[PDB]
Subunit: 155 residues, 2 copies
Amino acid sequence: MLKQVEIFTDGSCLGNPGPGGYGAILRYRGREKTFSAGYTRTTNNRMELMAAIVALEALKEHCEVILSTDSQYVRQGITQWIHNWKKRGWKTADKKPVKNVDLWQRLDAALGQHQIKWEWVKGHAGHPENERCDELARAAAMNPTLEDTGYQVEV
Amino acid sequence: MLKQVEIFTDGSCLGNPGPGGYGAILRYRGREKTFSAGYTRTTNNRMELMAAIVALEALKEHCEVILSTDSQYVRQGITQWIHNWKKRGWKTADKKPVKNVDLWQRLDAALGQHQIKWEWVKGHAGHPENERCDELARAAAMNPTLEDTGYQVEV
Ligand SMILES: [Zn+2]
Ligand SMILES: [Zn+2]
């Protein structure tokens, strides 16, 4: 069996678009690693993707990963959109580029390395690791230091 | 003096995108009138715009409108970007069409018809008519009968 790892992710955004941040925890046999960063103009959806991206990309070997997130956007993409995107050349049915394609592909690239068990939590209440990642994400959205270069401004 | 009228608006969407509806209430000196409709695949933000559009377009003369909504998206658009969009011709700084431009332009056309005084409510508790609009909108989302022809599918 592969090294099993727990990943917790969340994102936060003050607007749409607006200052935003992501939070992520990577735990292996008790030891924890935290990821967070804040951006001056982004979306909640993109922060939810970045949190999963940066945690998965930290993995230095093939792993069995339990990925816990309350993002409805990540759930709807993984369970409902990604298959059609793969067989469509990463375009919509109308043959147009998909939104946040830069991050969906980067996330899909990290997914191929590992065996992923997604656990879709209801909210962040109750689970301490999921509350800790919203704290990092919300704190980062309140203190942004970077530019989301991949966000194509729609307003 | 202008006829004063109260208008309450809300939207609901079961996905992003997914089935959705809008709910609006028009009130003229105690008397009350409702508007609502459900769409098969739309977004919550587009339903928030539709709610104010349908209620404002129902007025038959110049009015004083107390327009109450809890929509962050509508509030962001009005209080931040509505002036820049007109000055730029409904384009972004990058010379690209703004998101949901079809509904923002239609709302701007209706808003220019009356003297609008917005009341940004913060929640559903303690706001009966706003709560009704959420109920009207959710009922419509549960019984979609129309297609959001202006929604450009992003997935
Ligand atoms: Zn959360
Ligand atoms: Zn509401």
